[PDB]
Amino acid sequence: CSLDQTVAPGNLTLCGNATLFTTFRPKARFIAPEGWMNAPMGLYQRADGSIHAGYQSHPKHIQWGNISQGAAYSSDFTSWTDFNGSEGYKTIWPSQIYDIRGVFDGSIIKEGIDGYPTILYTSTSFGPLGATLNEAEGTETQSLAYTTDDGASWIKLGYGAGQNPVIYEWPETNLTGFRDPYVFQSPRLEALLANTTSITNATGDHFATISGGVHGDGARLFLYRQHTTGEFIKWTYLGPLVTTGYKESYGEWSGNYGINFETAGVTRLNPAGAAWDNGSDTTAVDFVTFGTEQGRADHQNHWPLWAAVDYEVRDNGSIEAVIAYSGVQDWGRSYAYASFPVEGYRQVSVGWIYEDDDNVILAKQFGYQGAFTLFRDLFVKVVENVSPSTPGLFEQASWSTKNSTDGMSVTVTTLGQRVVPETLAAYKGNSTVSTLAPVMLNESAAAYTPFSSQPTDRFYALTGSFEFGLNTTAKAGFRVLASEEEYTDIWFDPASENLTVVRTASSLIKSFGNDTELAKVKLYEIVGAESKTLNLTVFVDGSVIEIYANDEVALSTRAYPWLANSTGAGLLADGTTAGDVVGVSGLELWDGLVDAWPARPANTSQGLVWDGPTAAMYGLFAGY
Amino acid sequence: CSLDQTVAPGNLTLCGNATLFTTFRPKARFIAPEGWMNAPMGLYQRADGSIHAGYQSHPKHIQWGNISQGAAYSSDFTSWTDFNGSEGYKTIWPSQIYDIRGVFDGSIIKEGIDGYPTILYTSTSFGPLGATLNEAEGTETQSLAYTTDDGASWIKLGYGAGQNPVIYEWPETNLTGFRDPYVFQSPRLEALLANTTSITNATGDHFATISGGVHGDGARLFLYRQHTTGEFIKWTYLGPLVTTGYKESYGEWSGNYGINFETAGVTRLNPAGAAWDNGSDTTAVDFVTFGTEQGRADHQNHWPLWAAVDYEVRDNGSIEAVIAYSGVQDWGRSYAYASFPVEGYRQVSVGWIYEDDDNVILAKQFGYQGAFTLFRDLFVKVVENVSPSTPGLFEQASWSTKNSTDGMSVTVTTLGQRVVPETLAAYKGNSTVSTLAPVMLNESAAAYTPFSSQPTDRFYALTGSFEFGLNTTAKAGFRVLASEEEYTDIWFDPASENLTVVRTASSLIKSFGNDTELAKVKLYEIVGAESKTLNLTVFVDGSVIEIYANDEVALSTRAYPWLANSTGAGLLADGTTAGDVVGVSGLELWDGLVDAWPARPANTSQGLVWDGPTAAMYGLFAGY
Numbered sequence A, B: 001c002s003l004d005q006t007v008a009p010g011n012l013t014l015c016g017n018a019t020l021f022t023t024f025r026p027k028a029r030f031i032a033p034e035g036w037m038n039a040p041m042g043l044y045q046r047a048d049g050s051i052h053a054g055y056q057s058h059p060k061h062i063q064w065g066n067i068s069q070g071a072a073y074s075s076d077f078t079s080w081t082d083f084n085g086s087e088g089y090k091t092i093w094p095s096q097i098y099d100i101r102g103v104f105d106g107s108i109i110k111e112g113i114d115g116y117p118t119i120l121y122t123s124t125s126f127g128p129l130g131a132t133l134n135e136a137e138g139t140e141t142q143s144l145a146y147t148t149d150d151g152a153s154w155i156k157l158g159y160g161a162g163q164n165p166v167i168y169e170w171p172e173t174n175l176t177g178f179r180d181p182y183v184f185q186s187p188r189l190e191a192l193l194a195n196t197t198s199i200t201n202a203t204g205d206h207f208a209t210i211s212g213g214v215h216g217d218g219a220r221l222f223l224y225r226q227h228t229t230g231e232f233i234k235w236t237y238l239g240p241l242v243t244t245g246y247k248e249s250y251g252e253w254s255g256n257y258g259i260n261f262e263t264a265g266v267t268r269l270n271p272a273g274a275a276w277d278n279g280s281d282t283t284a285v286d287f288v289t290f291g292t293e294q295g296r297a298d299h300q301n302h303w304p305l306w307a308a309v310d311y312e313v314r315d316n317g318s319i320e321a322v323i324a325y326s327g328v329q330d331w332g333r334s335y336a337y338a339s340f341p342v343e344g345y346r347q348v349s350v351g352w353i354y355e356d357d358d359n360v361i362l363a364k365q366f367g368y369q370g371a372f373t374l375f376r377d378l379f380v381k382v383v384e385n386v387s388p389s390t391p392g393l394f395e396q397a398s399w400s401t402k403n404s405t406d407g408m409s410v411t412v413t414t415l416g417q418r419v420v421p422e423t424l425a426a427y428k429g430n431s432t433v434s435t436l437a438p439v440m441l442n443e444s445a446a447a448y449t450p451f452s453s454q455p456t457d458r459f460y461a462l463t464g465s466f467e468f469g470l471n472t473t474a475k476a477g478f479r480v481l482a483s484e485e486e487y488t489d490i491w492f493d494p495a496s497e498n499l500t501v502v503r504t505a506s507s508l509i510k511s512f513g514n515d516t517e518l519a520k521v522k523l524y525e526i527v528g529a530e531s532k533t534l535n536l537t538v539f540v541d542g543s544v545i546e547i548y549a550n551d552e553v554a555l556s557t558r559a560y561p562w563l564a565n566s567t568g569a570g571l572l573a574d575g576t577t578a579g580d581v582v583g584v585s586g587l588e589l590w591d592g593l594v595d596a597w598p599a600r601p602a603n604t605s606q607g608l609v610w611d612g613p614t615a616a617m618y619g620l621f622a623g624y
């Protein structure tokens, strides 16, 4: 096993455990100290204003199992500190018959048991568990724990009658899944249900959704309401909030609803951020965010989606969320988005970026798997003065349109996503910033033009505004993690409305994924404009490439170039001519970003372990 | 619910939880503070000379489940103190995927991990578990824990490869069971295997048996040897030590070998107690003690048995224990005998006495189930100068015979059992002792003659020597827990060789068992004697009646008379005449015995709880 990054890679499968720990590892984002991580969980803003982030964790292993909550905190979403207790960075782990198979996703009641922050989480026990298996009642239940020390530790309620687990009966038969309880307050739903509380007797100020589906009949999001304010044991099933068909698709802009939902949440947003009104704010929009499974041929069969919904009250005192329009939260190798409230009327979302090593060929040599996305502010994105000649505008697929009185302009409404400003300020302030001269890409443009300033390592951000003719057939974008022999190409092709990441040359290491990523991006043409603009921001962080377009479209992916000098970046141009010119302006390189984990040394591996022969006997976990 | 014990009992099923807690409860023996208990476990003499006793425990429930080790200690086997820690009187509980279904029986390595006392115990996980079910590998494994505080707490080894569980592979296919590891040192087995250690590479100074059987093909006791001295992870399977047939019986004196063994142990005894020789002591005998299941129509389908064995070395470096003769450790409602070494060359045995409420009609009103037997010294019982005209003497069923050179007398050898002298001394010293005049039972004897001194409560011992003609057809014994309308009759009938406990009138409460108990007792006639003698000792302790005959035969049973004055005792006589006279001498009543738990108040109930609806979903425990 040679680690010489100035020559072709050898047979890296001969390398020892965690020998590639630093080679591809993100440094500027949320990631576990070592081992396996997946979904964010237990997200809340603590009383001191700091952010508590949990995550599905399996230390000293590179596959899922014994799943636990790992945790850390931050004052700015950007620089983090691990908790350190009797179980290291874990704060909740399998310990009782009701959760011994895994502490799955959960969400926070800020003022819960005895007034303490409280998690409602999926407690799993024995039996087949999965949307394609024959799951039985009891395998997935919902349980409570509370913290008296601001997340350093959690105390579970006792096992038994009138204690844990608090939710165990399936609300409908033949569920595909029953997990990921999402607790939220909703002046909106309280106002809609206020005339019907005699039917259900549920009058609490918290709601919870549970994610699942019905065998052969599509995904379901189940709505519960806290039975009584200030009491956390009794949750009353109201009815299905979101009902979708078996592998139903709302179309090209909307992924696929698959067979089962995971990690679903409910929020209400306005153009500024989070909306706390009861329905009185005409600028506010109800949103559901949710993962779907088995509706996709790749990306681990997983879509992270969102929908704008209009609530209807049923005669039985329940809510139907009717989908108005439906989009994609991230088009790449990410999933399990969680959103939570933050002071200043913010709703902040974060997800999990998995690796692109689906055959588990170098996972042991890494000694870890997984990272978070960046933390994103959600808001209602409003585009004014949109031209009705914008191609495809009235399909209203993942956006709404509202005509002016005179029918000569349109207001477009969609879900907005942008990186939290604390992270952008910290990244820029800690970086070497190069402001680049604007570039016209014409007949003289090479396929690839390196920027006048170059990154020094695999930790940088790029931004630019690409101005295209209304009838362009030109393509442009950014090349990143680039040497002569390895590079990753990010293209936008306005004629197809496709943003692509081409990874055929991303790495000399052939075991990593090399498939092309694709997002749809609608350039809303403005009345009187003779051009259309893509604002593209790219974060490069070890192996993570995280792309944002127009504060709307996000695409997370992975690239693992071997060579030490595969760090370069610049402009891509295809079919640019004297007549079909792409104007590039607002160009900036941020080299370095931030050390997100300042207390951690470069190598936080503790080694890997095998569960031994009993892993295959129990049949619950891979064992490594 | 009336608790008036001066009138007939009402409908006691209407009484609240633990309202009958003190009514029938033993006071002079080992019993949990409350709730469910079964098998003794983790027995050892600590470094300070005190006795540590564990037991299968389910606090705040009256059925088995979440099975844990409860624990206490004593300097004299008689007066006990509970441990008190973070889990009350528990010291080991289900906590890991490998033991979450129950911490089953285990036994002690006195000098184990890091030199500390160490338990090897059956760690259970999910799946069908039972001799009549289709159990799979992994459901029952064997795991280690050690104590750094003399049994106040136990630290389990970690889960995984080269750690817990340490024994998990089935040594043969289609096991009926795989549990109750019994760790022991054996100079005898070390000497027998010393020429074969090249075949197996196992050279440690500890052996372990595991109890089980093979579907359709009878019980098995599996022998393991510690692979290396001072190392406790690796245990090498040698082979089956005891192999018996499917519901095989050695006859009337020997119960039935059933389909599966439980709680088996291995020892070596001589006439004084425990024998530590390598085979050089010609007076020493190898014994196996073991429970069997599904070979009995009643007593919960359970026989507590013992066998004298002759060891043979197999060519593959394993031991065959060939049964020489085979007996019964207790003929009544007891099971799960454990034996352990005690200073002074002693081997001490203790078991579990279950209730006689098999339909669980008043278990909640009790608020507890179960007690121990008394602690018994085991030894080789030798009877010299036995007459060859002793009926049935040369069947050698549960004893051996050795002729004198001249063939005119016989030495009889069997397993001896007697109550530990510390308990007899403490009971007698704390009691009001009445020494009773000898009585000849003849033509003038009533059916029942009360003793001249009477007990004052349900806590007393009786002793007597019953001298019968060699050709008697008379019956005699003791009546206990007796008023005019409730009583328990203990009869010996030399003509049938049957000791019976008749319980048709034991209680006015009709839901308790009322079936007749039976033991076989051989009166070894002595050369030159014109009579044969039964020495009978009876302990009455709440509802426990524990009978010992001739330091050989034990019979534990239960009686639950309702009336406050059902406490009397005396002599029984049937078919005694001027010619067929039973001489009764050495008569003594010990009234009061000892308060075995001086720190405990009279009512140690903490209430009962229900596990709720998930108990039936998981399907492992009754839930109450």
Ligand SMILES: *[C@@H]1O[C@H](CO)[C@@H](O[C@@H]2O[C@H](CO)[C@@H](O[C@@H]3O[C@H](CO[C@H]4O[C@H](CO[C@H]5O[C@H](CO)[C@@H](O)[C@H](O)[C@@H]5O[C@H]5O[C@H](CO)[C@@H](O)[C@H](O)[C@@H]5O)[C@@H](O)[C@H](O[C@H]5O[C@H](CO)[C@@H](O)[C@H](O)[C@@H]5O)[C@@H]4O)[C@@H](O)[C@H](O[C@H]4O[C@H](CO)[C@@H](O)[C@H](O)[C@@H]4O[C@H]4O[C@H](CO)[C@@H](O)[C@H](O)[C@@H]4O[C@H]4O[C@H](CO)[C@@H](O)[C@H](O)[C@@H]4O)[C@@H]3O)[C@H](O)[C@H]2NC(C)=O)[C@H](O)[C@H]1NC(C)=O
Residues within 6 Å of the ligand: A092, A093, A095, A096, A097, A113, A114, A154, A155, A156, A157, A158, A159, B066, B068, B085, B086, B087, B090, B093, B094
């Ligand atoms: C199979 O058997 C299993 C084992 O028995 C069983 O699991 C056990 O279940 C029981 C019952 O549910 C659990 O007991 C609960 O424990 C809760 C506390 O749990 C936390 O703390 C304990 C103990 O911590 C001490 O000891 C440990 C270990 O040594 C130390 O590490 C700690 O530092 C601490 O040490 C101090 O104290 C020791 C003695 O206790 C001293 O010896 C020592 O020197 C120290 O000073 C930990 O063990 C727990 O860890 C375990 O669990 C966590 C998850 O929670 C895991 O992460 C971890 O790995 C472990 O597995 C944990 O950290 C108690 O809060 C709880 O008691 C409350 O509930 C019951 C109701 O059910 C009440 O009776 C009781 O009164 C308490 O309720 C009151 O208090 C709360 C708030 O304080 C109120 O909300 C409530 O209304 C009520 O208020 C009352 O009091 C108020 C004021 O005082 C008053 O105003 C009110 O009006 C009212 O009166 C309960 O005891 C137990 O933890 C489980 N143990 C384990 C090991 O899992 C399992 O379920 C069984 N399974 C089945 C299938 O049956």
Ligand SMILES: *[C@@H]1O[C@H](CO)[C@@H](O[C@@H]2O[C@H](CO)[C@@H](O[C@@H]3O[C@H](CO[C@H]4O[C@H](CO[C@H]5O[C@H](CO)[C@@H](O)[C@H](O)[C@@H]5O[C@H]5O[C@H](CO)[C@@H](O)[C@H](O)[C@@H]5O)[C@@H](O)[C@H](O[C@H]5O[C@H](CO)[C@@H](O)[C@H](O)[C@@H]5O)[C@@H]4O)[C@@H](O)[C@H](O[C@H]4O[C@H](CO)[C@@H](O)[C@H](O)[C@@H]4O[C@H]4O[C@H](CO)[C@@H](O)[C@H](O)[C@@H]4O[C@H]4O[C@H](CO)[C@@H](O)[C@H](O)[C@@H]4O)[C@@H]3O)[C@H](O)[C@H]2NC(C)=O)[C@H](O)[C@H]1NC(C)=O
Residues within 6 Å of the ligand: A066, A068, A085, A086, A087, A090, A093, A094, B092, B093, B095, B096, B097, B113, B114, B154, B155, B156, B157, B158, B159
């Ligand atoms: C799913 O996830 C689960 C959770 O992660 C996981 O379970 C956890 O498994 C891990 C790994 O097996 C277990 O970790 C082991 O812990 C052993 C100690 O366990 C006892 O103590 C802990 C910690 O106790 C502290 O904290 C609690 C809770 O707060 C307090 O109550 C205590 O009072 C105590 O508090 C003090 O310390 C705290 C910080 O630690 C302070 O914060 C505090 O202020 C206090 O001062 C308890 O939590 C344990 O309780 C749990 O388990 C018991 C049963 O054991 C239950 O009854 C209970 O309910 C709980 O469930 C328990 O009481 C460690 O001994 C062990 O470390 C040794 O082993 C590893 C090898 O694997 C070595 O790396 C390590 O070095 C240690 O080995 C050395 O030491 C021993 C002897 O000391 C030697 O035999 C050995 O050779 C070696 O020697 C070395 O050192 C020598 C000298 O120093 C030197 O001479 C030698 O040469 C050599 O170097 C290991 O850490 C963990 O306990 C489990 N946790 C739980 C909650 O279950 C589960 O398995 C997962 N499941 C799956 C399917 O994967």
Ligand SMILES: *[C@@H]1O[C@H](CO)[C@@H](O[C@@H]2O[C@H](CO)[C@@H](O[C@@H]3O[C@H](CO[C@H]4O[C@H](CO)[C@@H](O)[C@H](O[C@H]5O[C@H](CO)[C@@H](O)[C@H](O)[C@@H]5O)[C@@H]4O)[C@@H](O)[C@H](O[C@H]4O[C@H](CO)[C@@H](O)[C@H](O)[C@@H]4O)[C@@H]3O)[C@H](O)[C@H]2NC(C)=O)[C@H](O)[C@H]1NC(C)=O
Residues within 6 Å of the ligand: A161, A162, A163, B017, B364, B607, B608, B609, B610, B612, B613, B624
């Ligand atoms: C005395 O000790 C018992 C523990 O043994 C304490 O708890 C009770 O235990 C018994 C079992 O011994 C439970 O009986 C079972 O009850 C269920 C149906 O239960 C539902 O209806 C009840 C009646 O009003 C109600 O109390 C229950 O409420 C509790 O549980 C829910 C969770 O479901 C929880 O949310 C609440 O907060 C409560 O804690 C519940 O809603 C029944 O299905 C069982 O039937 C089986 O067994 C019976 C009898 O053999 C048989 O007839 C059936 O056919 C079936 O086979 C069983 O009756 C009882 O529910 C428990 N009560 C509780 C927990 O409050 C009891 O509390 C102790 N008493 C005191 C005063 O401390």
Ligand SMILES: *[C@@H]1O[C@H](CO)[C@@H](O[C@@H]2O[C@H](CO)[C@@H](O[C@@H]3O[C@H](CO[C@H]4O[C@H](CO)[C@@H](O)[C@H](O[C@H]5O[C@H](CO)[C@@H](O)[C@H](O)[C@@H]5O)[C@@H]4O)[C@@H](O)[C@H](O[C@H]4O[C@H](CO)[C@@H](O)[C@H](O)[C@@H]4O)[C@@H]3O)[C@H](O)[C@H]2NC(C)=O)[C@H](O)[C@H]1NC(C)=O
Residues within 6 Å of the ligand: A017, A364, A607, A608, A609, A610, A612, A613, A624, B161, B162, B163
């Ligand atoms: C690096 O990190 C790994 C953890 O990932 C550490 O542990 C090793 O993990 C791997 C899995 O990643 C284990 O591989 C499996 O091994 C078994 C067969 O194992 C037996 O033979 C081994 C070879 O000599 C031997 O080491 C093992 O000994 C350990 O375990 C026993 C318990 O059985 C224990 O008693 C010992 O004390 C040791 O701890 C064991 O006897 C094999 O069956 C598995 O095969 C599956 O997968 C492979 C590969 O995909 C496939 O080919 C098969 O067809 C099948 O599907 C698998 O190979 C390995 O045994 C673990 N080694 C251990 C525990 O020592 C590893 O230690 C870390 N290295 C360092 C230097 O820290």
Ligand SMILES: *[C@@H]1O[C@H](CO)[C@@H](O[C@@H]2O[C@H](CO)[C@@H](O)[C@H](O)[C@H]2NC(C)=O)[C@H](O)[C@H]1NC(C)=O
Residues within 6 Å of the ligand: A465, A533, A534, A535, A550, A551
């Ligand atoms: C691309 O980014 C530019 C620079 O941020 C955006 O221009 C701003 O847009 C807002 C909202 O209309 C204005 O109020 C600002 O004053 C504009 N600043 C400029 C032109 O520098 C532009 O709108 C973005 N374009 C798209 C299509 O998202």
Ligand SMILES: *[C@@H]1O[C@H](CO)[C@@H](O[C@@H]2O[C@H](CO)[C@@H](O)[C@H](O)[C@H]2NC(C)=O)[C@H](O)[C@H]1NC(C)=O
Residues within 6 Å of the ligand: B465, B533, B534, B535, B550, B551
């Ligand atoms: C019944 O008990 C008596 C009294 O303990 C036993 O008699 C003793 O037996 C031992 C062993 O042979 C003698 O060494 C004692 O000296 C005897 N004491 C006496 C006669 O008082 C008697 O053996 C017991 N009988 C049976 C059949 O077990």
Ligand SMILES: *[C@@H]1O[C@H](CO)[C@@H](O)[C@H](O)[C@H]1NC(C)=O
Residues within 6 Å of the ligand: A005, A006, A007, A483, A484, A485, A563, A565
């Ligand atoms: C980078 O490294 C490779 C391999 O060492 C080398 O061949 C190449 O010339 C270097 N520079 C660039 C920009 O590719």
Ligand SMILES: *[C@@H]1O[C@H](CO)[C@@H](O)[C@H](O)[C@H]1NC(C)=O
Residues within 6 Å of the ligand: A011, A013, A014
């Ligand atoms: C890489 O080494 C592995 C062992 O990890 C071997 O099985 C595989 O064939 C090797 N690939 C080569 C030589 O191309």
Ligand SMILES: *[C@@H]1O[C@H](CO)[C@@H](O)[C@H](O)[C@H]1NC(C)=O
Residues within 6 Å of the ligand: A016, A017, A018, A019, A020, A021, A022, A603, A604, A605, A606, A607
């Ligand atoms: C990281 O540390 C681990 C654990 O000590 C070690 O096995 C590994 O080789 C180290 N890797 C690197 C790149 O230093």
Ligand SMILES: *[C@@H]1O[C@H](CO)[C@@H](O)[C@H](O)[C@H]1NC(C)=O
Residues within 6 Å of the ligand: A237, A238, A239, A240, A314, A316, A318
């Ligand atoms: C309420 O009605 C809806 C729609 O019919 C149904 O799906 C749901 O189960 C009902 N709620 C109940 C029965 O609580």
Ligand SMILES: *[C@@H]1O[C@H](CO)[C@@H](O)[C@H](O)[C@H]1NC(C)=O
Residues within 6 Å of the ligand: A388, A403, A407, A408
């Ligand atoms: C919205 O405006 C477009 C362009 O003027 C027009 O074709 C369409 O009919 C309008 N829709 C409504 C509801 O007026």
Ligand SMILES: *[C@@H]1O[C@H](CO)[C@@H](O)[C@H](O)[C@H]1NC(C)=O
Residues within 6 Å of the ligand: A076, A078, A079, A425, A426, A427, A428, A429, A430, A594
């Ligand atoms: C660098 O990053 C840290 C950590 O996020 C941040 O607090 C600090 O303000 C940044 N420095 C700048 C912008 O000068």
Ligand SMILES: *[C@@H]1O[C@H](CO)[C@@H](O)[C@H](O)[C@H]1NC(C)=O
Residues within 6 Å of the ligand: B005, B006, B007, B483, B484, B485, B563, B565
């Ligand atoms: C004992 O109590 C019962 C019921 O109170 C009574 O009838 C009887 O006379 C009393 N005495 C005896 C020795 O039975």
Ligand SMILES: *[C@@H]1O[C@H](CO)[C@@H](O)[C@H](O)[C@H]1NC(C)=O
Residues within 6 Å of the ligand: B011, B013, B014
């Ligand atoms: C005793 O009361 C129970 C309720 O615990 C009742 O079901 C049973 O029939 C009663 N027995 C009677 C009245 O004989």
Ligand SMILES: *[C@@H]1O[C@H](CO)[C@@H](O)[C@H](O)[C@H]1NC(C)=O
Residues within 6 Å of the ligand: B016, B017, B018, B019, B020, B021, B022, B603, B604, B605, B606, B607
């Ligand atoms: C024993 O104490 C328990 C628990 O406090 C109580 O429920 C029960 O009624 C008491 N029983 C008696 C006989 O005092």
Ligand SMILES: *[C@@H]1O[C@H](CO)[C@@H](O)[C@H](O)[C@H]1NC(C)=O
Residues within 6 Å of the ligand: B237, B238, B239, B240, B314, B316, B318
């Ligand atoms: C040794 O031989 C016995 C008797 O044939 C057999 O039952 C046992 O499995 C053997 N031991 C092994 C294979 O370790």
